[PDB]
Write a protein that binds this ligand. Structure first.
Ligand SMILES: CCCCCCCCCCCCCCCCCC(=O)OC[C@H](COP(=O)([O-])OCC(O)COP(=O)([O-])OC[C@@H](COC(=O)CCCCCCCCCCCCCCCCC)OC(=O)CCCCCCCCCCCCCCCCC)OC(=O)CCCCCCCCCCCCCCCCC
Ligand SMILES: COC1=C(OC)C(=O)C(C/C=C(/C)CC/C=C(/C)CC/C=C(/C)CC/C=C(\C)CC/C=C(\C)CC/C=C(\C)CC/C=C(/C)CC/C=C(/C)CC/C=C(/C)CCC=C(C)C)=C(C)C1=O
Ligand SMILES: CCCCCCCCCCCCCCCCC[C@@H](O)O[C@H](CO[C@H](O)CCCCCCCCCCCCCCC)COP(=O)(O)OCC[N+](C)(C)C
Ligand SMILES: CCCCCCCCCCCCCCCCC[C@@H](O)O[C@H](CO[C@H](O)CCCCCCCCCCCCCCC)COP(=O)(O)OCC[N+](C)(C)C
Ligand SMILES: CCCCCCCC/C=C\CCCCCCCC(=O)OC[C@H](COP(=O)(O)OCCN)OC(=O)CCCCCCC/C=C\CCCCCCCC
Ligand SMILES: CCCCCCCC/C=C\CCCCCCCC(=O)OC[C@H](COP(=O)(O)OCCN)OC(=O)CCCCCCC/C=C\CCCCCCCC
Ligand SMILES: CCCCCCCC/C=C\CCCCCCCC(=O)O[C@H](COC(=O)CCCCCCC/C=C/CCCCCCCC)COP(=O)(O)OCCN
Ligand SMILES: CCCCCCCC/C=C\CCCCCCCC(=O)O[C@H](COC(=O)CCCCCCC/C=C/CCCCCCCC)COP(=O)(O)OCCN
Lengths: 113, 83, 318, 70, 114, 98, 105, 175, 115
């Protein structure tokens, strides 16, 4: 019985040592690719800003055209009392677009498998 | 001393599963407080940059904040590479 | 092109089940100093085809006292879930890549039990009811232990993603770090698939045919297909979880071959186990899971929570 | 025998080889020949969506190198 | 409640960076080393202003710095870099680890030329 | 509001009505109680995910824990009622009046 | 009725989870973090009776961020007018709203 | 608008609720509640709640298995009732079905305040957030926070579970 | 969307197998053939009579131990936090009360089946 238990515990200790080294290396690798993401984030933020603002401007121009006949409609009138920037709702950005873009924007990531 | 000896003897003879279970549970409870690497695990968790490090507005009174990543100030992960 | 992949996954799995029937008959034969099927086709190769054709050209009967709707729904559920349980398995790439693949496997398995329960109840026969209640008891017996064992083993992996298990084991099999949990997990998969010595629900000696005694022809063949598919699926999962095969990104066929060999070894081990042992009484199985496996499993869960912290070995991907 | 059990085992092994090999080949065929992209988190999905937009053919797999920045 | 002011589509134009995510990931470390100044200026603007409309010029400087960086890379060694980002691009997770020879060659290239 | 929210609130109302109007079996009422909990879990989860309240992601789990305790409590009482009468019928429990 | 043991002992048994603007893991913000921050700072220390009248603007903005009732109304109005003008052929939608845009990074 | 998948899923949710609230045999009540749990898993999955959806599905599967055992043990009758074997069960089922129908019609073709407030529809996709960041799942982070932020919650729930075991032992003792 | 197609395909295949099984073979159904099986003879009572459950107490306990699993599944993510001493203390505390509730029901003869 001693020999069996000893072989078992030795096997476990070898496995623990190996996994310790391997998981430390994996954590270093994760830090490295996280830092790549960090170095890349400003460019993504800049172009995301420009993309959002361009979609909002296009919607604003199309809404100036569409809502000219209705009598008392301010084009581009906010629904908030505050004057600070509000992150656009998904519907506002893609409100006047095709169902394929709306589907890709709402459920594209959830459904990707 | 001799009461618990024969007690653990009878337990190892009658219920080795419960003996091993209580041994493993007790080890799991007490060993983490005696380890020098628990702090290493806390530090490893703290060194993982999940979100963007927002820069600080320099006011001329920050001698210990880097002005470029490769500058010598700021935290170092050298201890981690040799770990 | 995705439906091509779905069919590519499913058609082969059903063929592998068909020929697992033959392999089991021959392995049990040779362990019993006989041969098993060697007449229908060279080396009994055509025996599964004859069995399938014989079953789907025989008259299916609906019992007079049975609830027809659940009677017919139960085998559909069984076979469709048996096929569904394969889609997140990374071989080395999965058909469906999930973040929580292990937990999806748990939920689908837990839903699989209802088909046995419903079929027994729908039948409105005494032996079918006894088989169904044995199934209730079996789930109560192994469900808590099986989940906590997965949790304990998965702590080293860092997530519930099945494809991460390949990276976790690039240098060593995870059985060298958790062979006690591996033993208890193997026995829990024996109980979870209703296999000897834990196959109480069928109860062939005791209850003649258990839950499916009423079932005939095609509906019966569907229950059989589902069970054997589950036997291969569990073993494949066991292989991925404890014996990770080295994966080369530019040559995944090597991983596929290694993985298939390991799952075949585990399946043949099930057949061996069936050839070797007497059947457990159903009350005894509950005692075995609740008085021996659950204390050790709780202690080993504590140990596997404490160990990566003690040793600064915690895995990536919160 | 015992080696007469091996033909059925070989047929079963050939049937089990198919799903993984088919998934690998179909992934490579429908992802530009380079191992279908994994998006477990929304940052990877954003990378894929940006890649789809800049390709010009509405396919994420097509990759634009330094030959696209004049 | 007041009209929302938006930039015109003319002020939103810029010379885009039209390289894919594998190229960006292969260059990311040196790109974060070299273009740190405008990127940090832009992120400080962005996080103090809390308005994307107030940090357009910083974003355009970000684009121009990235384009200058990539132009230097193209001018001094496109071939080691292409090797490296092709290796990176094959991977479905785009893992840095499977490409260490190509990364080593690219790193020696930039260290000696620039 | 959204159509999905309306449907979940309707599910709660239907289960509540089911609990209120008894038939013969107690187990059916116990099921209705479980149904109410299920709809509460779904509703709270939808609200929490939508508003991105991160720390509130744990409260539906607590909800499930307590729901399990309530379910266990209900089944114990059913065991005792059935042992007394050989049946889980509501009509049997009429010993005490107002 | 309410014995404030937390405030007397300075414990924080459940106050960490009461609002959306309070110290989330990894600094993940709530969808309506700024609106709630504003409504909380506007009404702090003035009592319940004054806060309902004097901070109604911040609270109305907060509720609009939460449920977005006015935004959906405005979008519905715009799309109904678009449907009406398109049916008669008076208005033609732009190409970048039909799937033929020049996408940008 | 887009495919109205979640609307179909929530309607099937309501239908399963009508199924088990009609108070037919428990074998069919548990079936209805299993269907509801599965489609609610799907509903939550479509909003980014993978863990919570899969978890509620798992929990309710276990619960309904226990309930099936208890139904055969104590809820049996010579002729268990289905939705069409009884005027009372069938009437409740039909009334629930067409009540859901009336609510859905009145809500989607015009804009009425049923009880709490009103709604026009538009599909669920409009209220999303278009947020772009992260190497993690925010749901998983908020749920993992139970062990660092939610110490008090862990304490009270663990105590209640231990007390629940003690309580069922006390109730089922007899004497 | 791919998982929905997969589930649809699997359910459709199984339903088509059932359809073939019921519409291809010759059917000769009579009352003797369709009667309940009880090994040669007619059943005495109904199979819908109450069937006593002797493990009724372990079944209720399973409901409470199954929810312990919902509280323990986030543990791989909880390990990534910075205050590991609080996380470990809490995780250990949770499993200890789970072991104590098992020890309570075990010592009070709650795991023995009714006789
Ligand atoms: C809005 C309406 C809601 C839609 C209902 C769904 C369709 C069911 C209706 C047809 C079944 C009844 C047919 C029948 O009685 O015998 C047929 C006929 C008559 O036989 P008979 O001997 O002359 O008379 C028998 C007696 O009349 C009576 O004999 P009996 O004892 O068999 O009668 C009981 C039967 C009678 O039915 C009724 O009483 C009325 C029907 C209302 C049932 C709805 C209640 C809510 C339940 C949950 C909601 C499910 C979704 C519904 C929404 C639809 C959209 C998807 O009730 C049922 O069993 C219905 C079961 C349906 C549930 C299926 C779901 C399976 C669960 C899988 C796991 C879940 C995963 C997570 C998700 O015999 C046959 O033709 C052979 C059997 C045919 C059955 C095939 C499959 C059954 C239906 C499939 C279900 C659809 C799933 C998708
Ligand atoms: C101690 O005695 C016993 C044995 O020992 C001799 C056994 O083997 C044994 C097990 C039963 C055997 C007789 C095996 C029976 C074989 C199956 C029932 C046949 C199943 C095969 C088909 C239904 C699979 C489908 C057929 C296709 C070819 C697969 C592809 C599907 C298409 C769509 C493509 C039992 C129960 C037993 O009691
Ligand atoms: C006055 C009477 C005292 C004794 C009787 C009290 C009866 C109630 C039981 C215990 C009272 C609760 C006290 C603990 C409240 C938890 C919060 C506090 O302790 O801080 C925690 C400290 O954690 C410690 O581990 C305390 C928990 C230890 C308690 C375990 C056992 C105690 C309960 C025993 C009785 C319960 C029922 C019976 C079961 C045996 C977390 O601090 P920290 O993580 O730094 O920072 C959090 C902020 N972050 C997230 C931004 C970083
Ligand atoms: C692997 C899964 C997919 C496999 C792929 C194949 C899919 C197979 C689908 C399952 C059906 C196949 C079953 C095989 C036998 C056919 C069963 C049935 O459809 O045939 C008869 C259907 O016939 C009907 O009884 C009435 C005949 C005509 C009905 C009119 C329908 C409208 C058609 C108008 C006629 C004009 C020409 C139509 C063509 C354009 C039923 O007669 P019945 O005797 O009871 O059943 C016993 C069948 N036996 C004899 C073989 C044992
Ligand atoms: C080809 C001929 C087509 C005939 C179609 C008839 C369908 C039918 O219901 O008829 C009953 C028919 C045969 O009975 P008889 O009419 O007496 O004999 C026929 C031979 N004369 O019975 C059947 O075979 C029904 C088979 C089921 C059809 C498929 C639909 C079942 C739906 C199940 C839903 C549950 C799924 C749950 C699992 C999914 C969860 C993830
Ligand atoms: C039946 C039980 C349903 C459970 C389905 C679980 C499937 C699953 O887990 O896939 C998850 C997948 C992706 O999640 P992640 O892991 O985060 O990865 C992608 C993100 N990058 O999520 C999805 O794709 C959601 C797709 C819609 C959900 C499907 C809903 C299924 C509900 C079944 C209803 C049955 C039909 C209706 C009637 C039922 C009875 C008649
Ligand atoms: C501080 C550690 C805590 C965490 C670890 C534990 C986690 C999980 C393990 C505990 C699970 C609950 C255990 C429940 C105990 C039940 C006791 C009992 O009544 O069973 C006895 C059997 O056990 C006993 O004999 C009673 C207690 C005897 C001692 C058991 C172990 C006590 C501790 C032993 C080891 C001490 C510490 C380890 C040191 C190792 C040496 C270095 C009766 O057996 P039956 O099933 O009824 O037999 C029926 C047929 N005749
Ligand atoms: C330095 C820190 C290390 C921490 C500790 C780690 C070392 C742990 C050492 C002990 C490990 C033991 C793990 C075993 C778990 C269960 C053992 C057990 O006791 O179970 C048996 C019962 O278990 C069985 O015998 C199994 C029954 C079914 C057998 C099925 C086939 C046999 C197994 C075939 C080979 C198994 C291969 C498993 C792994 C496969 C690869 C994945 C108890 O039952 P009884 O003897 O009746 O006593 C109860 C009353 N006192």
């Amino acid at each position: 019985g001693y020999s069996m238990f000893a072989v078992g515990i030795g096997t476990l200790l070898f496995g623990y040592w190996s996994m310790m080294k391997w998981n430390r290396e994996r954590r270093r690798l994760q830090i490295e690719d996280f830092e790549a993401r960090i170095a890349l984030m400003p460019l993504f933020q800049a172009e995301k800003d420009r993309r959002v603002l361009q979609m909002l401007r296009e919607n604003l121009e199309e809404e100036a055209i569409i809502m000219k006949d209705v009598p008392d409609w301010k084009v581009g009138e906010s629904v908030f009392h505050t004057t600070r920037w509000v992150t656009p709702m998904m519907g506002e950005l893609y409100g006047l677009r095709t169902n394929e873009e709306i589907l890709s924007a709402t459920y594209g990531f959830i459904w990707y498998t | 001393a001799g009461r618990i000896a024969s007690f653990l003897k009878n337990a190892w003879a009658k219920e080795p599963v419960l003996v091993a279970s209580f041994a493993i549970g007790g080890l799991a409870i007490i060993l983490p407080s005696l380890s020098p690497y628990t702090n290493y695990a806390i530090r490893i968790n703290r060194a993982t940059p999940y979100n963007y490090p927002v820069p600080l507005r320099d006011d001329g009174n920050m001698p210990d904040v880097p002005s470029h990543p490769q500058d010598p100030q700021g935290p170092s992960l050298e201890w981690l590479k040799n770990l | 092109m995705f439906m091509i992949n779905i069919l590519s996954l499913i058609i082969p799995i059903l063929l592998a089940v068909a020929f697992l029937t033959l392999v089991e008959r021959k392995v049990l034969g040779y362990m019993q100093l006989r041969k098993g099927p060697n007449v229908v086709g060279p080396y009994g190769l055509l025996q599964p085809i004859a069995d399938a054709l014989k079953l789907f050209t025989k008259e299916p009967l609906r019992p007079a006292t049975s609830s027809i709707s659940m009677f017919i729904i139960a085998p559909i559920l069984a076979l469709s879930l048996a096929l569904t349980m394969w889609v997140p398995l990374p071989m080395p790439y999965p058909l469906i890549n999930m973040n929580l693949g292990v937990l999806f496997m748990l939920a689908m398995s837990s839903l699989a039990v209802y088909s046995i329960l419903w079929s027994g109840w729908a039948s409105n026969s005494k032996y079918a009811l006894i088989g169904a209640l044995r199934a209730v008891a079996q789930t109560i017996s192994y469900e808590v232990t099986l989940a906590i064992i997965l949790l304990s083993v998965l702590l080293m992996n860092g997530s519930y993603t099945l494809s991460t298990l390949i990276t976790t084991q690039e240098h060593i099999w995870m059985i060298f770090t958790s062979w006690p949990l591996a033993m208890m997990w193997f026995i829990s998969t024996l109980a979870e698939t209703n296999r000897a010595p834990f196959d109480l629900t069928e109860g062939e000696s005791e209850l003649v045919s258990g839950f499916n005694v009423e079932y005939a022809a095609g509906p019966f063949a569907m229950f059989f297909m589902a069970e054997y598919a589950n036997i291969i699926m569990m073993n494949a999962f066991t292989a991925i979880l404890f014996l990770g095969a080295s994966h080369d990104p530019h040559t995944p066929e090597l991983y596929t071959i290694n993985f298939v060999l390991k799952t075949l070894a585990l399946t043949i081990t099930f057949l061996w186990i069936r050839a070797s042992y007497p059947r457990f009484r159903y009350d005894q199985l509950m005692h075995l899971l609740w008085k021996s496996f659950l204390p050790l499993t709780l202690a080993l869960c504590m140990w596997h929570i404490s160990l990566p912290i003690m040793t600064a070995s915690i895995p990536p991907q919160s | 025998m015992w080696f007469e059990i091996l033909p059925g085992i070989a047929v079963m092994a050939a049937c089990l080889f198919i799903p993984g090999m088919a998934t690998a080949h179909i992934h490579k065929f429908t992802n530009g020949g380079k191992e279908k992209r994994v998006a477990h988190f929304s940052y990877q999905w954003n990378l894929m969506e940006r890649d789809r937009r800049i390709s010009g053919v509405n396919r994420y797999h097509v990759t634009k190198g330094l030959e696209n920045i004049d | 409640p007041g009209i929302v002011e938006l930039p015109t589509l003319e002020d939103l134009k810029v010379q885009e960076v039209k390289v894919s995510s594998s190229v960006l990931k292969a260059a990311a470390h040196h790109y974060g080393a070299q273009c740190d100044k405008p990127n940090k200026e832009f992120m400080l603007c962005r996080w103090e202003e809390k308005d994307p409309r107030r940090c357009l010029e910083e974003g355009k400087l970000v684009n121009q710095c990235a384009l200058d960086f990539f132009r230097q890379i193209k001018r001094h060694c496109a071939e080691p870099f292409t090797e490296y980002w092709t290796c990176i691009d094959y991977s479905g997770l785009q893992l840095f680890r499977h490409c260490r020879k190509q990364q080593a060659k690219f790193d020696e290239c930039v260290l000696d030329k620039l | 509001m959204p159509l999905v929210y309306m449907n979940i609130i309707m599910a709660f109302a239907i289960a509540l009505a089911g609990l209120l109007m008894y038939r013969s079996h107690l187990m059916s009422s116990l099921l209705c109680l479980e149904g109410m909990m299920l709809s509460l879990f779904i509703m709270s989860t939808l609200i929490i995910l939508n508003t991105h309240f991160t720390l509130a992601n744990m409260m539906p789990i607590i909800l499930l824990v307590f729901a399990a305790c309530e379910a266990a409590l209900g089944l114990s009482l059913l065991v005792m009622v059935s042992n007394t009468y050989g049946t889980d019928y509501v009509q049997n429990l009429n010993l005490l009046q107002c | 009725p309410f014995f404030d043991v937390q405030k007397r002992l300075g414990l924080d048994l459940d106050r960490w989870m009461t609002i959306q603007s309070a110290e989330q893991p990894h600094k993940i913000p709530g969808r309506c973090h700024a609106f709630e921050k504003e409504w909380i700072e506007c009404a702090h220390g003035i009592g319940g009776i004054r806060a309902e009248k004097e901070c109604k603007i911040e609270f109305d903005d907060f509720v609009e961020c939460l449920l977005r009732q006015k935004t959906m109304k405005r979008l519905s109005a715009i799309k109904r007018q678009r449907d009406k003008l398109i049916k008669e052929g008076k208005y033609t939608p732009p190409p970048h709203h039909l799937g033929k845009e020049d996408p940008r990074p | 608008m887009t495919m109205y998948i979640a609307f179909i899923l929530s309607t099937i949710f309501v239908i399963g609720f009508v199924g088990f609230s009609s108070k037919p045999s428990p074998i069919y009540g548990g079936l209805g509640l299993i269907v509801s749990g599965g489609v609610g898993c799907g509903i939550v999955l479509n909003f980014g709640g993978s863990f919570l959806g899969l978890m509620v599905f798992l929990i309710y599967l276990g619960g309904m298995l226990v309930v099936f055992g208890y139904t055969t043990a104590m809820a049996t009758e010579m002729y268990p009732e289905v939705w069409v074997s009884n005027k009372t069960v069938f009437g409740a089922f039909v009334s629930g079905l067409m009540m859901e129908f009336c609510m859905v019609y009145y809500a989607l073709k015009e804009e009425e305040v049923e009880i709490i407030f009103k709604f026009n529809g538009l599909g669920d996709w409009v209220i999303y957030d278009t947020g772009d960041s992260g190497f993690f799942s925010e749901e998983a982070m908020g749920i993992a926070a139970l062990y660092s932020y939610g110490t008090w919650l862990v304490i009270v729930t663990g105590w209640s579970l231990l007390i629940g075991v003690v309580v069922i032992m006390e109730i089922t003792r007899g004497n | 969307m791919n998982i929905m197609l997969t589930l649809l395909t699997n359910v459709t295949l199984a339903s088509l197998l059932v359809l073939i099984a019921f519409w291809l073979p010759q059917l000769n159904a009579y009352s003797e053939k369709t009667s309940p099986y009880e090994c040669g003879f007619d059943p005495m009572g109904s199979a819908r009579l109450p069937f006593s459950m002797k493990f009724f107490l372990v079944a209720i306990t399973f409901l409470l131990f199954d929810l312990e699993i919902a509280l323990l599944l986030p543990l791989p993510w909880a390990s990534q936090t910075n205050n590991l001493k609080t996380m470990l203390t809490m995780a250990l505390f949770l499993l200890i009360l789970l072991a104590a509730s098992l020890a309570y029901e075990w010592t009070q003869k709650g795991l023995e089946w009714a006789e």
